[PDB]
Each structure stands twice: as structure tokens, then as C-alpha cells.
Amino acid sequence: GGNYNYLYRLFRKSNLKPFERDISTEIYQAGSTPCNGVEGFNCYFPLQSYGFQPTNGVGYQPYRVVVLSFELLHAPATVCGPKKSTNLVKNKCVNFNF
């Protein structure tokens, strides 16, 4: 029947700055005529909804996305990979790192 809860914005005045976010819901104004908060020609609601349905060809089915962004300000340190410790020997001239 269509999952109409997943929307996207399809009209904006100007492209976003990187990592900028815009949740407003003002009536878009395409033409020169002012809109006064009501719909009509050249006065469009700015949000559309994917109507997802299970019988959609691939490329039409929902994909979930996660974007990891590593940043490095100027602190002293922070999270990182998980080092690995081998086995410690004994009674042998060895090259060690503790």
C-alpha cells in the first residue's frame, strides 16, 4: 500500500552548504508572485514522499545509508582502532614493545 512516511525535500532557494541541515516547511515560491502561505500555481509545498512498495524494481527500493566522518580538530587525542597484543616470550633475547 505504500510507506508514505519517508519524505525528501525537492525545492530550495539555494544548494546546501556541506553538512548543513534544513527542516523548515515554508511554502516554496517558484514564480514572482508572492505566496502568502497558501498553495497554488508556482506556490508549492516543498516536501515529497517516497511511496515505497515491496513490488518495486531494484533502484526503487529503500536503501539505508550511514556516513562516517572522521574529523581532527586540535585536541590531545581521542578514539581509534583497537590494537592487538601477541604472546610474551621469556628467557630469550627478544625485540619487545610494551
Binding site: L10, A30, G31, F41, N42, Y44, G51, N56, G57, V58
Partner: protein, 595 residues
């Protein structure tokens, strides 16, 4: 301003794709599982699509059309701004729909009763089509031909006269001169630097291409006439026209039921691989999987993998009421389904290749906007489907796909049997199609007044087609309206141009696949360069003029009849030797009653 029209169409392109989807998804559930709780499920969901489109149509006239520069956004705007009906008065608009419903139910429910038994009565499709396709009795074919026209066609005569007046009013309010000029608006092309095409230019290109088929059609008409005199002696003149009730069906549209009387060498079996399919235990799925391997052989994509679950390749395991008719569906959102009820036969092995060709055409232009997702004209869509069927019916393809003894010998006697069966369907329908649209074009513009409709109809049968009526018909009959496409408001010139595009595509692809022999032995398997020649047209849609689409495959800007004649030159050479003692041509003075 033009940038407001672009923002108009993108709201249209995302409300339409969803509303067209569920209006076509509900039409799938009715077609594959019939209840009445599905017919009411598709009539309200069908009307939400139609009510939405007239709301956006009346919004489209706020933008002018000549203040636009981009050709693509102009093409989308003109296809949506089209008024069509609704230009009439609101009491004339309901009179036109009453006529179209009355003419459609006369054709489907009209009955003919026997004069020896008035309690037995036949409909057209069960019983009257079987007499015209199977009988060899002269008196029974003459009864079924005349009684369909005198009992059903006489009811359509006062309805078709009122239909011409109301359709010419609707066409002249949309700035055409008549309704025939409205039908020729599909082939019109406006201002794309050298690729233009006028709506009156279609009339000369049909008549210029037709006078090069008349040498080939005259030798086919003379050979069939000489073979019909053995089947009906004392009924056919050796220098005259053919009687209209001895042609294989009700209207003489196809001559394909005359093959058992006109076969050149009846002691050679025409090749039929149906027994080799049931000897290797081929299921329902093998016929499509070998069809998918044909298309991936030429360099075309696989099926979409939603194609295999959602489709219904047979009638179900339930005794399930579901219109069983081969077709290809394009519901939207990249969801392609094929609906057919396939049996293990070489017939449905071939129409599997035909119906997959509609899918591969549909998968290619799916990146265009919504209003340009059709064929480039009305004739391209069926023509791409039938060059897939010609390449799969060759014995060269059948012996490499595993279905023919590697020790098979094709002789020159079986190629004549195959080519003559093709010419009874291809060449035999071309003067019928040309004559019928020429008659309907002259009726709409008024060159034929209504006191000469049936006089000019039968003069054009004797002169163009070479077919004479067995009983004289005055102006109380309407013999064109007894055909389906005339009484159900359909255009008929799409069957003429599709036949010419089909051999232009096939000859252009076989020069790219490096063929060496005759054109009728060709196969485009294992190539990649031919598929790249085909794919460059398939992805255009309606975004380009159709004359620009033809040069991407053929190399010309117009339809041409010389590739059609090159297909039939082995038959045309053999036909001119069988008509050394015959008379080629016909007389328009002889009649089967005029002695």
C-alpha cells in the same frame, strides 16, 4: 517564463509516477485473478488517475507554448496541454460517448441466425470466424459473408454518420482541418534542424512506397488466383478480381488461411519444432531462459530479477479466472511483468521472444521523464518486437540452441514454402491497410459525400486490392464499420508503417552482424556491434524526433520499401516463373453476378 514550466513538470513527474503505479497495479490484480471485488477495485483506482490528469491538463494552459526554447520541456508540455475532447459542448460530449458505446456493443453482441433453423444463432468470434477460416463450401462462405454485413453492418450506418460529424467538430476546435489530420499528428515533427515532417507529408510517403510493392503484389495475386481455381472451379475468372468471401477470413485482411490451398510443395513438411521440446522435458521456465540468453547474447541487460517472482508465466495451479492473453506490462517504478499462459509449442516459443522484446524496449527508455516513455511513434513498438521473432525462427538459430539434428539439410524447396507463408501475412495485408486508411481520410475531409460512401468503397477494392464483391451493396450498408478498428475508434496506419520499419531494422542489423547470404536466413546472435546499433535507438523514447531515431539504426530519415523487397526476392524470382502462362493483373469490370 520558461523556468516556471520546469518547476511545474517536476511536481508533475513525482505525483504522476505514483498515481500511475497503483492505477496499473490494480489493473494487474483484476487481470490475473477475476472477481468483481477486483473490478470495483480497479474502477475507482482507475478514475483517480484520469481525474488527476485533467486537473493538471487545465493547469498547463497557464504556460504559453511558443515562449519555450528547450526542445525536451516543449515536448512534455505539448503532450499534456492537449485538449482532445472537452472542446465540445457538454451535451455533444455525452452524445459522442453514447455512439461509441452503442457501436462497440453491436460489434460484440450481434448475432446471425440460420434461415434453415432460426433458433440457432452465431456470434462473430465463436462460430462465424470459424466458418470463414475453415470452410471450403462456396455457399456457406457466401452466407456468412453477406449476413454479417446485412444484419450488423446496417445497424452501424446511421451511427457512423453521426460519428463523423462529431469527430470533425472536435478536431476543428483543436486547430486541425479534419479528424484524419488529427490522426496524422503522431508523425509530425516541428523544428529540429533538418529532421522535420509534415502531417500532409505522410500521405505522399505512403503512396510513393506503395507503387513499388505493386509489382510484387500483382505476382502474388496472380499465383493465388490460379490456385483458387482448382479449389473453386466455375466460380473464379482467370483475368478478373478475387471474390471477397474466399480470402480466408471475414474481411480479407490476412491471406494466411489460404496456405493449405496455395502451398508450393505439399510433400515437404514446413519445419516445426514442437516434438523436440516435449522430448527433452522443457518446462514453462526453459522457454524464457533461452529467450533471456538470446538477448544477453547480443549485448542487452538481463531480466530485472523481480521479473521472475511477480510474473505469471502460466495460467495458475488454481482453476483461476484470469484473462489469458500474451502481453507486456510496464507498471512503473522499474517493475516489469509479463502476463501470458504459455504452452510447450514453437508458437509460444516465438511469442516469448516477441513479448520479451517489448520488455527490453521498456527497460531502455526508463531514464527519460514520465511523459516521454513511449515509442518514438506508434509504429516502433511492435516493430522492435517482431525482429526478435524473425531472428529466432530461423533454422540456423534452432540448431545452435539445441532443437535440430546437427545433420539437418535445408533445401531450396522448403525456403519457398517458408517465404510464401510469410508473404500471405506480410504482403497480403499491405493493400488492405493502404486502401482502408485512404478511404477513411477522404471521408473525414469530405472528398466522399455520404451518398457515395459504399460506391467509392467498392471501386477502391477492385482497383487497389483486386477484390470484387459477390452481391451489390447500396447506401444502406456500411461495410467498413463491420471491422473492429473502424467501429471501435482506432487508427489503422500504424500497421502499414510497422511492416516497413520491421525490415529496415532487420536489414540494418544484419550488415552490422556481417551476414553473407539472403536476408531471410539472418540471425543476430553472438554479436555485440549489432546490439550497440540497436541500443542507441531503444533508449531515446520520445525525447527525439522519430526521423532522428531512424538514422541511429538505418542511416536514413524516412521509411523505405527496398529492405522489404530484398527479403522477398527469392520468392519474387520463383513467382515470375510460375506466371509465364498466366495473366498478371486484373480487370475491374468482371463480377461474379454479372452474367
Amino acid at each position: 517564463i520558461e523556468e516556471q514550466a520546469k518547476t511545474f513538470l517536476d511536481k508533475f513527474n513525482h505525483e504522476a509516477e505514483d498515481l500511475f503505479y497503483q492505477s496499473s497495479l490494480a489493473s494487474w490484480n483484476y487481470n490475473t485473478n477475476i472477481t468483481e471485488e477486483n473490478v470495483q477495485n480497479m474502477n475507482n483506482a482507475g478514475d483517480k488517475w484520469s481525474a488527476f490528469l485533467k486537473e493538471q491538463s487545465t493547469l498547463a494552459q497557464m504556460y504559453p507554448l511558443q515562449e519555450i526554447q528547450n526542445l525536451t520541456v516543449k515536448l512534455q508540455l505539448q503532450a499534456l496541454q492537449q485538449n482532445g475532447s472537452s472542446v465540445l459542448s457538454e451535451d455533444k460530449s455525452k452524445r459522442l460517448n453514447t455512439i461509441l458505446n452503442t457501436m462497440s456493443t453491436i460489434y460484440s453482441t450481434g448475432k446471425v441466425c440460420n434461415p434453415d433453423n432460426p433458433q440457432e444463432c452465431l456470434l462473430l468470434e465463436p462460430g462465424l470466424n470459424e466458418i470463414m477460416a475453415n470452410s471450403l463450401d462456396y455457399n456457406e462462405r457466401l452466407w456468412a459473408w453477406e449476413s454479417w454485413r446485412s444484419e450488423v453492418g446496417k445497424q452501424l450506418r446511421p451511427l457512423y454518420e453521426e460519428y463523423v460529424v462529431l469527430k470533425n467538430e472536435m478536431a476543428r476546435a483543436n486547430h486541425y482541418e479534419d479528424y484524419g489530420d488529427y490522426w496524422r499528428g503522431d508523425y509530425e515533427v516541428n523544428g529540429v534542424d533538418g529532421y522535420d515532417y509534415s502531417r500532409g507529408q505522410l500521405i505522399e510517403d505512403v503512396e510513393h512506397t506503395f507503387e513499388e510493392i505493386k509489382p510484387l503484389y500483382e505476382h502474388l495475386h496472380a499465383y493465388v488466383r490460379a490456385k483458387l481455381m482448382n479449389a473453386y472451379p466455375s466460380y473464379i475468372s482467370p483475368i478478373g478480381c478475387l471474390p471477397a468471401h474466399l480470402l480466408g477470413d471475414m474481411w480479407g485482411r490476412f491471406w494466411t488461411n489460404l496456405y493449405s490451398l496455395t502451398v508450393p510443395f505439399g510433400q515437404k513438411p514446413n519445419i516445426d519444432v514442437t516434438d523436440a521440446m516435449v522430448d527433452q522435458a522443457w518446462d514453462a521456465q526453459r522457454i524464457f531462459k533461452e529467450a533471456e540468453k538470446f538477448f544477453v547474447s547480443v549485448g542487452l541487460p538481463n531480466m530485472t530479477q523481480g521479473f521472475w517472482e511477480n510474473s505469471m508465466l502460466t495460467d495458475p495451479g488454481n482453476v483461476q479466472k484470469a484473462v489469458c492473453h500474451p502481453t507486456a506490462w510496464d507498471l512503473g517504478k522499474g517493475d516489469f511483468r509479463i502476463l501470458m499462459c504459455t504452452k510447450v509449442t514453437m508458437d509460444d516459443f516465438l511469442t516469448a521472444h516477441h513479448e520479451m522484446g517489448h520488455i527490453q524496449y521498456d527497460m531502455a527508455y526508463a531514464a527519460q521523464p514520465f511523459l516521454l516513455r513511449n515509442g518514438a511513434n506508434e509504429g516502433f513498438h511492435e516493430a522492435v518486437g517482431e525482429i526478435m521473432s524473425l531472428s529466432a525462427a530461423t533454422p540456423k538459430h534452432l540448431k545452435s540452441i539445441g532443437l535440430l539434428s546437427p545433420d539437418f539439410q535445408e533445401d531450396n524447396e522448403t525456403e519457398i514454402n517458408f517465404l510464401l507463408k510469410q508473404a500471405l501475412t506480410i504482403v497480403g495485408t499491405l493493400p488492405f491497410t493502404y486502401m482502408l486508411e485512404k478511404w477513411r481520410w477522404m471521408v473525414f475531409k469530405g472528398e466522399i459525400p455520404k451518398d457515395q460512401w459504399m460506391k467509392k468503397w467498392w471501386e477502391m477494392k477492385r482497383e487497389i486490392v483486386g477484390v470484387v464483391e459477390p452481391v451489390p451493396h447500396d447506401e444502406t450498408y456500411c461495410d467498413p464499420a463491420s471491422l473492429f478498428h473502424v467501429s471501435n475508434d482506432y487508427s489503422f496506419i500504424r500497421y502499414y508503417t510497422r511492416t516497413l520499419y520491421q525490415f529496415q531494422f532487420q536489414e540494418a542489423l544484419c550488415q552490422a552482424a556481417k551476414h553473407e547470404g539472403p536476408l531471410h536466413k539472418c540471425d543476430i546472435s553472438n554479436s555485440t556491434e549489432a546490439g550497440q546499433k540497436l541500443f542507441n535507438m531503444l533508449r531515446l523514447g520520445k525525447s527525439e524526433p522519430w526521423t532522428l531515431a531512424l538514422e541511429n539504426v538505418v542511416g536514413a530519415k524516412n521509411m523505405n520499401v527496398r529492405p522489404l523487397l530484398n527479403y522477398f526476392e527469392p520468392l519474387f524470382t520463383w513467382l515470375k516463373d510460375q506466371n509465364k502462362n498466366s495473366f498478371v493483373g486484373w480487370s475491374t469490370d468482371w463480377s461474379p453476378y454479372a452474367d
